[PDB]
Symmetry: D2
Subunit: 234 residues, 4 copies
Amino acid sequence: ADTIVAVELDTYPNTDIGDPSYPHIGIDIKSVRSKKTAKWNMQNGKVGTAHIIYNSVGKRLSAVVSYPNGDSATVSYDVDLDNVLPEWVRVGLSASTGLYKETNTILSWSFTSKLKSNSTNALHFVFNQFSKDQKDLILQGDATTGTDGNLELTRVSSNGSPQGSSVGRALFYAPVHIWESSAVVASFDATFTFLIKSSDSHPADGIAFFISNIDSSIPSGSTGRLLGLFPDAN
Amino acid sequence: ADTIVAVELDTYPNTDIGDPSYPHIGIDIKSVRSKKTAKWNMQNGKVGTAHIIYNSVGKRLSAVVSYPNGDSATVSYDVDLDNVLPEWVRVGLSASTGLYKETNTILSWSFTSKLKSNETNALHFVFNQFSKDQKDLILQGDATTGTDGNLELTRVSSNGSPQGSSVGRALFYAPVHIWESSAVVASFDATFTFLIKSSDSHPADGIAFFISNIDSSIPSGSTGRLLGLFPDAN
Amino acid sequence: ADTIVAVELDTYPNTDIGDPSYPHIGIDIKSVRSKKTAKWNMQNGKVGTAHIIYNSVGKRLSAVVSYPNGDSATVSYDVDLDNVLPEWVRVGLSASTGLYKETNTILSWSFTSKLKSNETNALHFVFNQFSKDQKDLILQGDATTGTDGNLELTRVSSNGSPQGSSVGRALFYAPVHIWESSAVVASFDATFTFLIKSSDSHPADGIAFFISNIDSSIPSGSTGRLLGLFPDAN
Amino acid sequence: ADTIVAVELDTYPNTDIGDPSYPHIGIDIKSVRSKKTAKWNMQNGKVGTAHIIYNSVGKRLSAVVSYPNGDSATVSYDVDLDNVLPEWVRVGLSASTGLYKETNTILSWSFTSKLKSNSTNALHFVFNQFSKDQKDLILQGDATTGTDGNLELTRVSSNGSPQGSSVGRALFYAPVHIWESSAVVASFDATFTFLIKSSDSHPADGIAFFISNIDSSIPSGSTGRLLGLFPDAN
Ligand SMILES: CO[C@@H]1O[C@H](CO)[C@@H](O[C@H]2O[C@H](CO)[C@@H](O)[C@H](O)[C@@H]2O)[C@H](O)[C@@H]1O
Ligand SMILES: CO[C@@H]1O[C@H](CO)[C@@H](O[C@H]2O[C@H](CO)[C@@H](O)[C@H](O)[C@@H]2O)[C@H](O)[C@@H]1O
Ligand SMILES: CO[C@@H]1O[C@H](CO)[C@@H](O[C@H]2O[C@H](CO)[C@@H](O)[C@H](O)[C@@H]2O)[C@H](O)[C@@H]1O
Ligand SMILES: CO[C@@H]1O[C@H](CO)[C@@H](O[C@H]2O[C@H](CO)[C@@H](O)[C@H](O)[C@@H]2O)[C@H](O)[C@@H]1O
Ligand SMILES: [Ca+2]
Ligand SMILES: [Ca+2]
Ligand SMILES: [Ca+2]
Ligand SMILES: [Ca+2]
Ligand SMILES: [Mn+2]
Ligand SMILES: [Mn+2]
Ligand SMILES: [Mn+2]
Ligand SMILES: [Mn+2]
């Protein structure tokens, strides 16, 4: 299967599969069943910001999600990504809807990865605007870009209305050398701003930043609770 | 054919096709026949640094090549890249040998592109070492990656000996959005360090940083004076 | 006197001292009488962006001023700043009013300087929010920081009204090493966003990004057309 | 007393004040007695690199010291620096010798701090070469810069021999806004490369990256095991 590291903003509690019984942020290591979660109040129709930091030296993947009012949720998990991820990866953003839905709108996305010995390899990109033809993104499933300048990870019905059983992802075009055996520091950070909007009984399913094998594809049947990330709930 | 913008470090005077009659640096705009050149003393077997700066506001593409002893060559050309390049490009390094040869070894290469506004998209990468399997580079022709942690643009022997009739290029994997009609600033810079070494009667043929259409390939017969860049000498 | 290189956003035509007869951006080198100007449509009450670029290869001091409707004015002047500026400087923002007035509100300011090779010294600061007690800015004359996250270079009344005969500057706290003899490029850039509002159909006097000796202070009487920069209009 | 957060590269075990009985990197929070240490193989006369990372999400102050053969030592300590540091600080490098001595030579220092909320205030500096009159560094005690491009924190004799009972520090000229209550992520990193050379039975006393109140000065008698940081060994 693919190998997945993800920070999910999980708007829908699937308690059947380990979710806590609230919207949450969580850190996913090779499983949709988060290794750590924090209660998250998603603010409907508001623009949130997710910051994801992996500290290669502290061996700690950390995330915060916040909204302009001050409200933030924070999660940290101690992990050495050297033992999890392959050396080369693609990075991206994933969202899904299932029986319930929400807009999974990305308004900006940056990423910085650095491999240090004494000499550094580094990759930084920032999207503050997405083109209708955003050639440096691989769009997968239902994901689209433009002309409002946003990345729509799942189907949105152009009057702005979220569609259910949708799954979409965007990966940065270039593979990322995310760790190296000889790298003293293999750190990365990612930032994205998003607009989740739902009028549903409950919003579902969430957005994730993720790191995958290079050839990673949306697994068959990963709408809903699987966030476009996983083939199953294991 | 391809659309090419390049800064050449041309180790070989092809005075039959417009070269000045000395090793030179030059700024190539859709032709191997540089728009501006400066005399350049290539220092055999020394590590040189090339800095390329495109100032989108100043509409000036500038280049310096220097060596540790301070000796530098500078060229600037006034040009609006909006009128030359397609919106989406690949950026890369090119080198060739012909009837004469030299090593065209790249030891480092960084690039930063930024589009403002009204906000900023950016791409920055830096390579200080090149891996055997450098997945974020499209290698073309004879170009191979390290060790000695180096990018060899043209054929060299494992024991350091350059080959004639060689052409190779390395392009960053991701397409770059190099300008956009609504960009207030569409600037970029590139830097690379290189080791050109020859025991030939004359070193040839040079190294270029270039920017091409996304699908750019080595044009047939662009070994030698063309310097993996152009289909002919027009 | 101080030594001043400035990029002026001059709102008030002082035709008796060589201003053209329209609001303009200009490049000032040791004189308030710009070496080069471009006509500028100041958009009253709109948030403008100024971007300022110089490197020691092209030696072209460029500035663009743009508003989010996409109107922009650009000005460039080739000038060798090695020959103009002290090696070490402070960098700053300055603004002034005289008989006529405007708010000279800075909403953000960023600056980068670099000296490469053989390696890099760099200074980069970004202020997107100014703090009430901004310990890394030297505020001079009427300049004040909020709350409201803004820098008001010149005095604004309680009722929102800009006051005349005001001058103020903010300089970054650290000296900046603007050129170094062994450097093979020296580059700087600066960007700032600003909000000039006038209810006089006579906004005055304007805002400058400036570079000066480290001990630079507001020349006496440099309110109004002298922009907080010059002791006289020579 | 100053408030000190520091990462120490402690060459000399002062077991009577809680050092482990080996050279060590440690995390110091308001005491010379490190909250956490790791055993460190100081490679006499090799250029080492220290990397220090903290962010306010993960709140893990991590540091690694490595040498080009790939030997590294890492230490991390979870600590909420909001509760330790003043909001504004100066950042610096400190070193000392006592009865025993070592060159405490700094070959490079880079620092970045950022305060993000909605998408950022930032300070970044890098010194790869120290200038004889480095106007953006505040040198304290025995510390001296240039003409060799290095910063010698402690006294080195004309014949190359390091002197005992020496303390010197370099702080960056500007105050750094290390935390802000409205920031959702405050982060800093620091990298420095160093060359510790002893010809004796033993090297002492070590080098620290430190963060302090803006008016921080060398405490009296803080040569030796106090590393220029602390007034006592409490
Ligand atoms: C076992 O019963 C299930 O009930 C839920 C909804 O109540 C439904 O889950 C689907 O929709 C949610 C919300 O989008 C997703 O999280 C799930 O993955 C799934 O698609 C089941 O289908 C059943 O009715
Ligand atoms: C007609 O004579 C030409 O002679 C030159 C060199 O003697 C040769 O040029 C080749 O080699 C150079 C140097 O490497 C390249 O720049 C050229 O493109 C070419 O490959 C010509 O082929 C002719 O013989
Ligand atoms: C000529 O006498 C004055 O009238 C002028 C206006 O022409 C005024 O100049 C002041 O105001 C302008 C606009 O703000 C500035 O550019 C000048 O420097 C100055 O402050 C004089 O002060 C007198 O009123
Ligand atoms: C016990 O008397 C002293 O001997 C110690 C060392 O054992 C010496 O300490 C000095 O040197 C060490 C090593 O440099 C430092 O860590 C100390 O702080 C101090 O400078 C004393 O000075 C006496 O010689
Ligand atoms: Ca869920
Ligand atoms: Ca040639
Ligand atoms: Ca004027
Ligand atoms: Ca000690
Ligand atoms: Mn979950
Ligand atoms: Mn040529
Ligand atoms: Mn003017
Ligand atoms: Mn210790």
